[PDB]
Structure formats: structure tokens, C-alpha cells
């Protein structure tokens, strides 16, 4: 029985967003790729390279013109006529433009494809943009965070495979599954927060009890994402857990909002 | 066409030109072109990064104890390492002392980001390069269990596993839908394991891939995920609490309890999975001990990591040495310092960035981020590069060079200067492994040698882990908790002008950041990455970089199938997002 | 001395008497006692229960959607069970019908349980029985990987694998602290498996006692925890919540993954290592398939279980088959009515109880549980006893019947009956089952037959786990959502004065739950639980229970060391905390 | 190097504590058994019944006398002169007091051990009684809920094997690290309860979005455990994020407090 073919292109990135996704703990990345998708071109993983890899995009997006998911990862640069990101000799942006018009759906992974993350944070020298400013006219799923969370990544793809249907959004394009919810909506340090209980200096005695660490910084109150329920790498921890404030990385422009330890 | 001698090398552009773009298999974006002569043989490589970024730019008038978060995103693949050298060069400017706890804790960071890092680069990304996946559906699966059983006291061995690990592959390739085999190499005559080492492989592929998810758990419980874990000036954010109430909210025995569960498995992988797996790619293609080898007889460096003495970054605290060898003097490991403007120097007249002079290597300090896309006649026009450049500006990386001197980092660069260094346990395993290969010292020196390193590295790094578990638990047994130095974190307590340098050995070789910090801003922010070095363009003597020079005189035995380009660039585990910033 | 007829048997307390006080590798406190002959052949047998707490008096008086939380905690092993009998006693009271997810969410956590308990039984109570674990420290490592191959696809065989398990047994023994193994049966002639099988056995302990933590996750999902998870009147509180704001507070889809996740794993482990586990111990025990057969030939009992059709509890929806066999009579399966007073009674002549009249019995709506600690003449005193009397009273546990007939409940009985009604599985795998041991139909009716069927069931479970976790998804596929009725919570909305009745298959067997409300409160509540049937003391006519029963005409090589008793009660799976409750 | 002795005793009991503790993930119970201490009585697991069972506990508490931590599970029944709960013909209170005198140290655990739990629910039949109500002349560690979280469970076991020494106790003798906080101290749905956002019944769209339980009748604000943060088999769940209001397992007396539904 044919899965549905995916293809996963790469702009201006980390790659985090990949790595996050194989670190699926259920189903298993392995699981997605052998039963749930065909993940049919993505460059970090591929075997093909170069004329090989170009042969492979070429065909996979006409043999499957209208019927394949295309996943982004990072972004086009319009700087240097969209130069500061190069493939196969010519912009980016012309492979993303190509992928976009045979795509059935869209998914812009990460804070890079659904806002612009670390590279479009002042001064942006590249004009590195998202996705929803460039295709304009196909169904795209943002899926912010710094990177995502693993186990939602792998969850947006089980639900769009089973149920056959695009997640419903909030007004900007996010699942509600997932980002319908603040962090401090659902903070396990919200009673502390309550008390004007708060961590003061790192390490103080309020940091050994896990006080709330608004005061040093969290962005938890206007950040939208699940990881203060679903939580980091199979449910082990969150920023918060382990005694980080929220950098407010599921956000748009959350680099440029001010220092992350301050109000 | 050209002809120019350099390190040994007669670099020439006639002959047939190849162009590998996209480079897959890597991080990031590179483009790869070379020349071959009438016997299918490399004359000329150009190595080109095809993405940019610009962190130093982004980082310009940042808050100093903000910059680590910025920075991590450098890679995601690398992840973390950024982060820590940030937190070390902020630290070195400021004159902050971490306690030590959060020293141990930095170094689990450290050795975790080796363990994961090496594991994924060997199977998902090398891997394909060596095993030849679809024959695999050729093997015989209880020929399969011999080998493996052979090599390895791995428990999943059995005929039955392998026979299952077939049918899955069988079934998954049966309706055409190859996925992320589609349109590659199989069938190359390079491809030199019989079919049940090419089953064994893919099996362990597969391992590997589920495995390393728990891996990274270690990063969750100190840095709260991954990728991307968190980090402060100062020390750590992850409180302890072992003993008192509120210990719910903080680093317990539970929290630790599951760190120590994940490393012993993560050691039990590495020894008997990954390492049995790279002496069998060695076993099989010995050959590969002769190709590849570029700078690595040549010129190595290394700035040394993990100091065991917190706050000491000097000879006798980094646990994996530091030191720079050159013009093939392995007798003479030279001292390697980051604040001397003779030592590191970047050159930009190959690439993409603009000095007031071209001529002439800026040390970090120096450094200038001056974005300039100008590639000169590329057979095409400024967006459509047919053929690079490279007598003029052919990439986004610029070219680093140590005393003038252009040098191969990473794990052989490392393991060769430990080993002329004298460490004991280098010694002993370098020997072991070229002894058990049947193959001189020499071998190591090759894109073989390359992956060797690696995979004992990863082993190095497992061992590592448990010591500084080991020493973490000592230090809360005597009731020494201190995560955090906060003396100096509000601005006020600054010196108005300083600098400072925080340096480390990634998964791919030597970084350094440089800061300088003015009236608690971020004046300057320098970074000179692993792949930054090896992946580098040529400077204004035509010097060639690591990568260019592995890959001259490689003979491949199918131009329009780039395998031999591939096996060697993949041997260096490129990072290109790194490489560019 | 005293001897007298009943099922066959010739009841006869002359000779040498044997106490076991405590029994272990069960749940709970039991003793047993037996009179052997000359020949080392028991000829009486005497199952007594050893703790009673007292639930059903706890429960008087209390809220009827409180009382799944403590009846749950009858027993921690049968974890779940008791809570799903009290929902559905409840349920079946007010005029409750839950929505079908609730349903099928139930199913899952019962069928979970099954997988559970099953598989911890197997290894961790009743496999030191047939494994000798200090003769797997004589095998070969490379033989038991070759038998383990012989048996099973299961990766986990390698050579080098059993070396390190034998390892750490031999490093464990090795400072004379031997722990659960200190002063067990070894050596003992009816040891029979070769020293291979022995360490495959051992190994396989290990890693079911590692891996039915995982099991359990799925308890934890839609029940918050394991063990004693969360339960309502009306459905389940697992709220289910896919594509909508706040879906990160409720069951959606990454929680329905784990779930998926843990099925596969489950099914998995059961069906690879578990099942041809049971078969090599039948394969190397065959005589002990004519060993211990009791009342399993004669007279066996099941309720019935999951309910596949929601609010359903006949004969179209159970997906487990309800019935009763007496006599023999395997071709009248008869139908079993819980509210009928004349079928389930339960007798307290020699139990530790006060009727009014001790010489009949009480169905579960007129019951009494008034305690009586009453030994009368013992060998010693009430409060040292070397010697209960069975003439009289001798349990705290009571004495069911069925139409007056002592019963067999559990694996082998839910086996039977759903053979012999034509259950086209169950015919399938018990005759394939007794093929692959070339022994008769017959042979299940055995203490080896009952560790079978027992394994049997853990596969079949494994199975229902799928099918109802597909038909939670198809539900939510077609916006299905609902986990609970509420317009019967409060409880204004109740009969004045009703009744019900709860059951269910526990692991061990046939459950029911008898409660009456008054006025908003627990008027009675009576549990009839599976080892209250199987551990049962006699009855008036002197009928003796399952364990008397199995026990009976048993040889025993060494009179001292109760090896034979202990396999044939531990064949049973007694949970003594149900039993008595 | 000799593992540290442990004897571990049933009374009156259901088994869940036993059970909670092979549910250990990190350190797994094998490897407690095998490597961290020496397991050396314990009915639900022991091979040797019977006088071979009696030969042991009697050779273990000889040999090991003053050297012994004891773990109790369940309690001893006051009523029918012990005989509500029978070990070797005998009251199991006997074997208690046998074991207690030689021990080190005792932990009790479980609501059963430390208070009564539901066997001591009214009107307590088999007059049930904690074990610190019998032993009064040794240190005992309280480990109450029902059961206790096994990763706990094993937690507290490590600390007493690496440390050398017995944690640190709140006044009612139970460990700090887990038990100094209350559950909605730490509760994720605390945001909800500050909000006045609560489940009104069971199903409702406040419960399908997370709302917090207080109205159905949650006694986290009376409860101290780690449920809230340390989670239950393996960071997977807890009572109240699956749904249900926290029944106050781990404090003394909490089945008489009243309906798990009520106020
Ligand atoms: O049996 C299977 O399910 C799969 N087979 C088929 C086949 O062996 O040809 C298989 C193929 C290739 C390698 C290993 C294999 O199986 C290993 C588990 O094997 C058995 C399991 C249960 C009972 C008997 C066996 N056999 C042992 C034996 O194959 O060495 C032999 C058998 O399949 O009859
Ligand atoms: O080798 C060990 O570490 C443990 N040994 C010791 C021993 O063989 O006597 C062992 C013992 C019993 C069963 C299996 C065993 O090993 C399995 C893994 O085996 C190897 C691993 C790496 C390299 C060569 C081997 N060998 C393969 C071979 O045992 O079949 C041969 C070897 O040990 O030299
Ligand atoms: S730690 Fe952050 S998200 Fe949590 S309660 Fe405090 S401010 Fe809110
Ligand atoms: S659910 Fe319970 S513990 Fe959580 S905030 Fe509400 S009342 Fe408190
Ligand atoms: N390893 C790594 Fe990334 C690169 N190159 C860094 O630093
Ligand atoms: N299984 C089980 Fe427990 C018993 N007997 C119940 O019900
Ligand atoms: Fe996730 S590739 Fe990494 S930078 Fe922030 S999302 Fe981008
Ligand atoms: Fe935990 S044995 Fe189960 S009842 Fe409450 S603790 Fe007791
Ligand atoms: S920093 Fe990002 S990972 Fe979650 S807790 Fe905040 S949205
Ligand atoms: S019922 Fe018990 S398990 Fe935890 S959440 Fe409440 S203390
Ligand atoms: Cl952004
Ligand atoms: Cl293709
Ligand atoms: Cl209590
Ligand atoms: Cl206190
Ligand atoms: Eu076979
Ligand atoms: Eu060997
Ligand atoms: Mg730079
Ligand atoms: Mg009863
Ligand atoms: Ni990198
Ligand atoms: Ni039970």
C-alpha cells in the first residue's frame, strides 16, 4: 500500500529542525520513514547527491505533481539575489518556489521556515524570510520552536497520514493541538509564580527549590508551544525543568524582544 | 587551464570539469567542483560553502550573557558547542570562574554532543557511503549471524533478526518508493563488502537511528532539550537539590539515576556496535588507508578540550590535547595561542567578504564579516554558477590558517597529536587498531583513517562521561553543590572595555570564538569553526585547504558517480552552516 | 485420622502431614498443608488463606463512585481489575451506559493487565520452578545461542549475549550472597531442562523483568499511573482531545503514539520470547501435562469479558466467552447468570466467617462478611499453629459454587470453554499448540497446561490490544470523542434502592462484584473473586476446591522439599490478597 | 565488594508496592537486585518456601544482625490476636518485631506501612496499625503513597546505597527530597486553579482543554508527593494530567477525608 511521499527541502538553517524530528520517540523516526512517509528527497539523509539528488527532486516532483507534502526547513535569503543560499548553482529560492507549486500541503518546520529564527534577527544581513511571505498561494502548517518539539513534529505527521487532513490552525497557522496553549498556561512552576515565589540569582536557594523564573527572565507568559505538558525528548525535561527561563523560541521575532533575562 | 605547485600538489584545471551540487549527506549547504585528466584522476578541487548566515553581525551590540543562545544556533547538528565556547570566551573576557560542578557538568555537555554526534555522522550520514544497502537484500541472513557474532558479543544477532531486517527492506523497496535510497550509488564497483556485512550494516543503521534519541536525554536533564540546550554566563542553570525539600524542583537522585542509566548504554552501543562496525569497513576496504590522505601528513591542529581543572585551560587540565604540527614534523607538536595575531589568521581573496586589504589574514580580534557576493565569470551569471572561479572569490567560507600555514582539524588531527604528544591511552589504541587492521601507522592518515578516529573517539567519549558522572557524584557525596557563579552577572560589575577568547574541540576539530565586550554590549564576535578550517578556500599564495587537498589525486572509477568524492568529504563530517555562521 | 469420597478422590489425613507456611512467588499470604503416604504420594491437601483485610465491610456506607478506588486496591498485582468490575457493578446499578470510547479504553486497560500480569507470572513467580538458574552457570554460551536460534526470531541470541548473562550470575553468587536464589530448590531430580535451556530461561527473566515496566505506560496514559490507576462512574477521566486549542491537556495524538508504541513492543516480547519460553519448558515437562489436572477435567468456570459492543454484557459482545462445565461434560457448555440465586453461592462451614446457618450457602446479594477467627482443634493453638484441622474451620477464605459444583476458574478454564463453544481462534491456536508438543487435547487439562494457556492468553491479549486501539482511532476519525456519561453522576439522580452486578476475566480468573445502594449510599458490597474460587476451602458435602483438588495423588521425590506442590500452586497464579480481600 | 543487605517483609497488604518498585526505570530493578543491594528475603520473589523460606529469613538476620536495612510492605492486624494476618502459623506482628530488632534501619513503604491505608479505612475490621505505632525503638523512613512512584522508590535506595547515610526527613519521618512540596505546589494546571478555569463534570470542554480539577474533587492542595514533577512510569503521566483529581494517596487517613469527589 504506497505512503505518501514527502519532500524536505533545506533553506538558510541549523539543521535542528531534522534533528529534532529523529528524535522521535513514537513512532520512531526510523517507523516514519519505513512506514508512515516516503520521504522520496531530503538533502541531510539522502543517498543521492548532486546530478543524482537533482534527478531525484526532478522526478518525485512530477511523477507526484499535487499529491506530495513539501517540508521546509530554514528559509530563502532575498539578499545578493538570493545567493547567500545556493543550490545546484542557482538561488534557493527557485527550488522552493518548484517544490511549493506541486506541493498537495506545506509544512514549515521550526521558528526558520515559520517566522525567520536566529538569521532574520536584527540586522537580518541576509533579508532571510519565511516561507508564508514568499508561496502564496498553498496551505502551509507552522510548526514554530527552536527547534520543535520531537514528539509533536512526529505527531503532526501521524495526524495528517490517519486522518488524512491538515491540523486545524490558530490565525497565524499553528496547530491548536499543540500551540493552542501558552508555556505558562501549563507550567508546573505556575504556583510559585502565583506566590511571588521567584528565582533571584541562578543557583539561590529559590533556583534548589524550582521557582518560577519570571524574574529571570521567562518568556513562558506569551510563548505558545506544549513543552511545559508534552515536554523534551520523550517527556525527560523543558527549559523550564532543568532551570533556563523560556527564551521564547516558538515566537515570532523572539530574538529581538530584549535581552532573555530581561522584562 | 592553469598549473600552479602547491604543498606538494600540481593543482591543474584542464581536463574534464565535475560539479557535486548539492553535496548531500553533510550539514548544510556546499558545492563541490574538480577537475580530472585523461585517467579519471583529480587534478583540482574546489571546495565552496553555499549558504551564509552572518551570526557575527546578528551578535554585534547583544548582551554578553544573551550571546551563548544566539550562537548554539550556529548548528543544530553541533549543537550545544557553540553554546559552550560563548559561555567560555564571555567568561575569559569578563574574569569569571564557573564552580566546579558546572565545569563537570559543561564536560558532560561536551563528551554527550562527541557520543551522539560521531554516532549519527558513522550510519546516517557516512554509513551509505560503505554499505551498499540494496545489496543487502542479497544476503544471506544466518551468513549474517556468523559475522556478526564473530565481530561482536552485541546481543541482536540473531538469524531471525537479520531475516526480519531483510523482509523490511524487501518490503520497503518492492513498490518503488526507495525513499532515501532512490537514484544512488548501489552497484559501484568502490563498494567492497560481501552482502552480509551490507546486512549487518543497514541492521545497525537502523539501531543507530533509534538509539541515539536516548542519547541526548543526558543534554534534556542538565540543558532541558534537545537539540538545543540551555546554558548561562556564569556556570549552569540546573540547580542541584539531592537532600532538601523542594528537591522535585531541581537536579535529584532521580535526575541523575537517569543520567547514569543512558550512559552505560550509550558506551554499551559504541563498543559493540559502532566500533565492531568501523574495524569491518576497515577490514574491507583497506585500500581507502591510501586515499585521502591531503594535509593530515602535513600540517594538524588542535586547540584541546574538556579541562579537568575548572577554570584552567592549560597543558596539564585539558584531558584531549591541543598543539599544531606543520610541514610533516610529528617530532615538534607546537603550542597553539589564540590571542597571538601571528597564530590564526583568516584570508578572504577566494571568498565572498570584503577587507580594506585581500592580501593580507586578519586574526579574529581583527576580524571583519563585510558580506561581498562577487564570483567573478562562473560560465553563467551571478545566479547561475556553472563553474566556479577559484582564481578569484569561489565560496562563503572564509580561509583560516595557522602561522601562515593551512591545516586539517578534527578527530585524526586530534588523535595524531595526542598519539606524537605521547598520551598513553592514544598510543595504545592507535596501535591496536592499525596492528588488528594489519596496516602501518601511516594508514591512519587517509579519508580510512579519518573514520577510524572517529568511531575511537566516540568510545573516548563514552569512557568520559562515566569519569565525570563519577566526579560530579564525589563532589555532592562531600556536599559540594554550587552550580553558579553570580559574583559578576549584573553589568555594573564589568570592566568597561574587555576581550576574551573561549576555544573547544567540536565533534569536527578546533573552534574558538573571540569577544570583545564595550560598555556591556557586544562590540565584536568573531568565530573561526572546525569546518571553517577544513573546508576552506585558497589563500593569496594559493594555498590550498583540507578538503581541496584530500581530494587531489583520487582516482574515480566512474566520473558521473561521485562515490570517491563523497567517501572523502563525508570523512571530515562537513558542517557546512558551521563552516559559514 | 479420617478418610471420606468426594470427586473422584479418596480424602485421606492419616500419615506424615507436610506444612508449606509461606508460600512464596505468589501474591499474598497463603499456607498450605498435605498428608503424603508411604509412597510420598499426597493423599489430602489443604489450601489456606492467611491475611484478610476486610472491604466489604470497609465499603458500607460510602459513596457508590468512590468505592473502583478502593476496591482497586484488593489487589496490586491484578492491578485495574477490581476497579473495572466496581464501574461496571455501579454501572449495571444506576442504569448507567458509558460512551464506546470509555468502552474501548477499558478494554485496553484490561487487556493491558492481562499482558502484564501474564508475563510477570511466567519469569518472576512461577519460572524458578522450571528453570534452575544455578545450573544455567554450567551451560555453553554458544549452545544457547544455538537452541535459543532453534526456538525463536528474537534478536537478543548472540554467543557473547548469554556469556554476559552468565556472567553476571556467576559475579553475583559469587561473594555467597545468592538473594532470592539463597537455600531455592536446585538440583532437584525434577529439574529437567539441559544447563542451555537453563541460561536461555534466566536470560529471558532478566529481560521480562526489565521490559514489562513498558507495559504498564499504557495504564498511565489513560489511567495517570500504574500500579492502581484512575477510574469514573460513566467512562473514563482521560478526556480525549485531537485537533483542538488545549489538546496539550488531554489524550491526543503524541499520547495516543506512545501508546501504539508500547502495543507493538508488547505484542512483540510476548510473542518472541514468551511463547516459545512456554513451549521449550512443555517440550522438556511433558509428564507434568498428566500432573496436577484437579477439577480442570471435571468442573470450570468463566464470567465472560470485554464487551466489544459498549453497555453490552451478552453473549454477541463478550470477546472472551462466558460458560460453565460440569461433570465432564465438555459438550454442555452452560450459561451463567450472576443475579440467579441458586448458581454462585458462597459456603463458610470451613472458613473463618459467621452465618446463620453454616450448612448452606449465600449468593453474593445475601452475603455476610462477618469475621471469625475460629482454628478450633489444631495441632498447637490459635495463635501457633503447626496444624490447621480441616475438619472444621481453616481459611479466611470462603467457599464458592456454582450450583453447588466446586469450579476451576481462570487460564485453562477460560481455554476450555471457549474451545469447546467453537471460538474458531481459540480451537486454532490450543490445537496447534498441543501439536507442536505431540501431546493429546487432554494435556492442557495439567499443571503444565495451565502455564500454556496462560501464555497462550498473554498472546491473544496482545493481540485485542491492536483491535481495540484501531477502534478507538476509528472513532476519533469520525469525531467520536466522548469518554463519559454524567447524567446519572450526581447522586439525586439514582433509584432510591438498587442493585447490580460487576464482572469481568481477571488474569487469574472469573470476577464479580455484587453491589446494593440505599439512599445514595453502599448499602453491600461483595466480591467473589478468582482465587476465592481456586484456593476455595471445602463445603458441607466436603467438595474440595481446585488447589485440594490439583494437589491431590501428587508424587513428591523428596518429602522436605515442596518443589512439586509449588509448581502445581504456582501453575494457578494465586493472588491471596483477591482472595480474601 | 558486599552488596548491603535488605529483608523485606509482607504484612497485610495488596502488593502494589512490590510491584511499584519493579516498575523502576533508572536504576532498573534488576540491576538494584543484581548490583546495588542484596535482596536477601522477599515472599513475592524468593525461589525457597516453606521452612526453606523460614531457614533463610532466620540465617539472614543472624548473620547480618545490626547490619540489615528491613523494608516493610503492608501492616500488622491488632485484632484476633494478629491472626487476621498469618505467617508460619504465627502473627505476622512476630516476624515485624524479629526483623525490626535487628535492623539498621526501616523503610516503610507505601500508605500501608506508614499509616494504615485501606485496610485502616473505617471501620478498620482488622484493626490495622502503622508500623511506626509498633516499632518504636528504630529509625523509619516514611515512603507513603499508594503505591509510591517506583523511580522514588529506587531514588531513595540510591541515595542510602551511594550516600551511606538515610535522607533527610520532614517531622512525619518521610524523605524531603520527594515529599518537602506539595502535588499542586508543582501541579501544571495550577495556571487553571489561579484562573478559577475548572472541570465542572467530567467530559466537559474544560476538561478536554486541561482545566484544573479542584470542583471534581482534587486533594493535591493537601497532598505532599512527586507526582507533579517527577511523574509516574518513567515521566509519562500523572493522576491529574490523565485526568483524574489527585485522591491524596500518600497522606495518612486520606480514605476517610471523605469523597474523592467532595470538598
Ligand atoms: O521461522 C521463521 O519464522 C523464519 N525463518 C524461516 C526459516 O527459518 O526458513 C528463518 C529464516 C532465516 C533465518 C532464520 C529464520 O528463523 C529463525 C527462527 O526459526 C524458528 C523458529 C521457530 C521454530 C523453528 C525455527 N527454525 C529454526 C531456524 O530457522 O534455524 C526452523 C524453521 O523455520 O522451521
Ligand atoms: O570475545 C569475547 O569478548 C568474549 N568471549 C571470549 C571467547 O571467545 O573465549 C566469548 C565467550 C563465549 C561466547 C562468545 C564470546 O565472544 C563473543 C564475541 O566474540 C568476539 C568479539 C570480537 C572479536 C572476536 C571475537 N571472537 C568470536 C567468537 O567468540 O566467536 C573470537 C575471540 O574471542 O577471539
Ligand atoms: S517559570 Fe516561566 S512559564 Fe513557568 S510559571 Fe514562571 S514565568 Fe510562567
Ligand atoms: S488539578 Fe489539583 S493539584 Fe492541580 S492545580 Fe488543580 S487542585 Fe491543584
Ligand atoms: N563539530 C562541529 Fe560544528 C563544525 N564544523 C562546530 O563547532
Ligand atoms: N487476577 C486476579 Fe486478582 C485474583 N484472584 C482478581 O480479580
Ligand atoms: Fe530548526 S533549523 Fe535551526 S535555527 Fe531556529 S528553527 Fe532553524
Ligand atoms: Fe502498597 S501494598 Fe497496596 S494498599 Fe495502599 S500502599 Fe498498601
Ligand atoms: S524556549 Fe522554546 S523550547 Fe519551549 S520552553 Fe520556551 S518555547
Ligand atoms: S492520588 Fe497519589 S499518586 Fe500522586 S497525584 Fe495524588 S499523591
Ligand atoms: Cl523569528
Ligand atoms: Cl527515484
Ligand atoms: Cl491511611
Ligand atoms: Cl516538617
Ligand atoms: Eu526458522
Ligand atoms: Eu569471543
Ligand atoms: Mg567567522
Ligand atoms: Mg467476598
Ligand atoms: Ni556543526
Ligand atoms: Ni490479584
Redo the contacts between chains.
Sequence with gaps: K??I?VVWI?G?????????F?????????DV??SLI???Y????????????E??FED?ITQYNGKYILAVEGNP?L??????????????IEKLKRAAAGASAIIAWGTCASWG???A??????Q?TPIDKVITDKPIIKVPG??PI???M???I??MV??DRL??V?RMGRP???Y??RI?????????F?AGEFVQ???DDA?????CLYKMGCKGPTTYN???????????????????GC?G?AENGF?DRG???SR | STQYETQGYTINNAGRRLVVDPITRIEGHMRCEVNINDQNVITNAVSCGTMFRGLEIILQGRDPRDAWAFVERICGVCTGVHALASVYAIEDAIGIKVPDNANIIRNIMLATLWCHDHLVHFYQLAGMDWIDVLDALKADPRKTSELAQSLSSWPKSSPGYFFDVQNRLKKFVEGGQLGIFRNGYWGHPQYKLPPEANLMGFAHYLEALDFQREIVKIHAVFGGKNPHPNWIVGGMPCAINIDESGAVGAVNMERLNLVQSIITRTADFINNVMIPDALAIGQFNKPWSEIGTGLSDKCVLSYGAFPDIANDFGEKSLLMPGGAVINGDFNNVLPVDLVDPQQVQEFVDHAWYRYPNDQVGRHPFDGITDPWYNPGDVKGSDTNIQQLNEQERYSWIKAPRWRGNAMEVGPLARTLIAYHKGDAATVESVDRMMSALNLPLSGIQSTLGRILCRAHEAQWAAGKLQYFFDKLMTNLKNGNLATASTEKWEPATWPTECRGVGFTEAPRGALGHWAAIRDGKIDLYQCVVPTTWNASPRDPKGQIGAYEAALMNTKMAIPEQPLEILRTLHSFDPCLACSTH
Design positions: 504506497p505512503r511521499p533545506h538558510l538553517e541549523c539543521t535542528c529542525c531534522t534533528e529534532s529523529i528524535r522521535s520517540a513514537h513512532p520512531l523516526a526510523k520513514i519505513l516516503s520521504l522520496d531530503d538533502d541531510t539523509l539522502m543517498a543521492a547527491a548532486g546530478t543524482q539528488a534527478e531525484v518525485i535569503p539578499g545578493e539575489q538570493g545567493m547567500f543560499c545556493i543550490s545546484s548553482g542557482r538561488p534557493f529564527c536566529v538569521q534577527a536584527r540586522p537580518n544581513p541576509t532571510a527552536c527547534p520531537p514528539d509533536v512526529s505527531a503532526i501521524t495526524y490517519t486522518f491540523p486545524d490558530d491548536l493541538m499543540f493552542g496553549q505558562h498556561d501549563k507550567c508546573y512552576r505556575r504556583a510559585h502565583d540569582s541562578w543557583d533556583a534548589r527549590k524550582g521557582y506544549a513543552c511545559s505538558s508534552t515536554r523534551w525528548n520523550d517527556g525527560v525535561s523543558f527549559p523550564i525543568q532543568s532551570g533556563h527564551l523560541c530574538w535581552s532573555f533575562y
